[PDB]
Symmetry: D2
Subunit: 186 residues, 4 copies
Amino acid sequence: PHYLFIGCSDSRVPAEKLTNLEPGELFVHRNVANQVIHTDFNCLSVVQYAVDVLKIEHIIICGHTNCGGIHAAMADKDLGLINNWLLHIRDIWFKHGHLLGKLSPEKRADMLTKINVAEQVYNLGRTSIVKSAWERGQKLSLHGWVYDVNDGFLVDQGVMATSRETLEISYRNAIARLSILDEENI
Amino acid sequence: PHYLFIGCSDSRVPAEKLTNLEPGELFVHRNVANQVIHTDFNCLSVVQYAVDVLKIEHIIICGHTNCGGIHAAMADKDLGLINNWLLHIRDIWFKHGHLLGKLSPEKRADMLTKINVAEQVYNLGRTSIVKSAWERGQKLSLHGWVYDVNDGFLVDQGVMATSRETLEISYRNAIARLSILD
Amino acid sequence: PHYLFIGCSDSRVPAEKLTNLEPGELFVHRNVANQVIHTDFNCLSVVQYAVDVLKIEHIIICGHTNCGGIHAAMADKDLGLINNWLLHIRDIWFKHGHLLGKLSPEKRADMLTKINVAEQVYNLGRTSIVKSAWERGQKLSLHGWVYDVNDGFLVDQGVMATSRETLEISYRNAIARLSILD
Amino acid sequence: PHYLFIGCSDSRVPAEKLTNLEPGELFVHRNVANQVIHTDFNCLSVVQYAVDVLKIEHIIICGHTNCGGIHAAMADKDLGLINNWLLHIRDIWFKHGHLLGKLSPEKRADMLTKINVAEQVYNLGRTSIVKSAWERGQKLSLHGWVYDVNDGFLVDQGVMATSRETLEISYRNAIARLSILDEENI
Ligand SMILES: [Zn+2]
Ligand SMILES: [Zn+2]
Ligand SMILES: [Zn+2]
Ligand SMILES: [Zn+2]
């Protein structure tokens, strides 16, 4: 395995399709809305294992459009235990509430999906695990993609980091690019 | 989707190919050595969302032979943070230490991969989420599977549960069947 | 017990002395920098047990000045695993980066300790556990406190919530009061 | 601080009383039934911080008799989310089910309390954190106590470990001593 893939439990396309890699090359974690929560033991131990033990040099976080987890985060109904998991997504919503407010209602979900990926790569790059790997000169790249379920194509996004400094630049640029609106507003 | 599939992060077969089902039918969680740890918020919330919100009626836990997670748990090297995750597998090894001891060292892993699946289904069945769904008459079945690629085959790992009664029985029975040695 | 007290692991005053209540009244959780992290199974299950089983009607979150956890979160050294826990505090610093920037460096910590308490009460109030108790008319109040031992005093840190309405209002107001600088 | 204290959220006696130490010497974690769950980020990060950063040389896990968490684990009602936390206690019950079965019903709780502490010290000593500290020759002792709420006195138990080898011996001996029954059976 040369790639750690963090995808959503909704996503129906296996990482094999979205990476074009042969089975065997992918180590895969899947959770609701493809999160890297700072203190999630499950995902963190996967990342530490991939980076420190398997010496994987690429981590891909992949979100997707029409994501039930994102939709569920936004609908904010009393879904039970999962609501607590999705509160990290609502924090990201409100961190970007002015931006999201400028979009037409039916465009906001897919913007949140893209913002989410950027935020999760930013979290991943700040883990003790990735920061330490970078500090000691280990080769490690982080990638944040979004897959369009409608037209079955990727969108590389451009969140790519190979060090703590490019993490800052890449994260900032991604949010700046997301803030430039097309025909999503009236 | 109609199925929740809980599988391993180092598994090399997609759930869609194992199940031979539509891309659409499977809601998927993957973690190291396909665990349902009692207090893991990640897996538990997947389960709660699947059972209570998506109204899924089948949960599959799928292990596999030649599992790097099971092997790591057994090697017990200083791997770092991941060792803490895998201590749950070491607890499983010790629980079945007598059985696993009376077996050739090169065969222990694959026995442990199967025992592990039975233990995780038993854990799944004891979650507040699943207990309470069974208590209120909700239709819900748990399946423990192991796949092997020396060739290409499966085994509904003797573990099938539709209630807490059938969970005790199926769990104990699955352990007893595994205890008969080739 | 009638109170759940959530405080800091490096706090040097017992909850019983702060509250001046009986040994018996306080159910107690302590973690580093007194956090209510959305997905922390440890704190959340304490909260659920306290609210749903013990039928406790008051939750206090208590921060303190000269907090080693807040200081660690700010120093951002390579401390190891603990840094991951404290990233939630760094997220809080960034959220209030403009406010904290227009303040003397030796005063930032104590401002951040207070902001932190307001943020954790807001988190507590947004748990499925507390939301749902408020929705079904259950009597339940949340209090954010900071104590200071330059001398010995408290402050119900402007944060008091008995509903989701009063949570938004009290949260925003607590932030606004903290934003007026001495 | 020279002591990390892991106690129960029930316990009403502050660690100051049970250790006789001055305020300032104790770093304290409290959770339901004083557990060290292998993958609990909260408690593990506390332990890693105490051991690696604060250079604390003593960790005390303290349970107590008449523990609501233990009682709640045993009653096995549908309490909700907390049931999942307490499932680690029921695993310990069934790991020792033959022993517990020989006791009179009204003696079983306080035996589970003692067994629990032993099991939690054993977990603590197996963390990557404590095992590594020991491996590199760091001075670190683990202590498992139980406080009797009825007669306001401690019971040191004798779970004490200063290395991985004494962890095995101490844990085994503790369970062996717990298995020798007084007048708790008929
Ligand atoms: Zn999704
Ligand atoms: Zn595997
Ligand atoms: Zn503190
Ligand atoms: Zn207790």
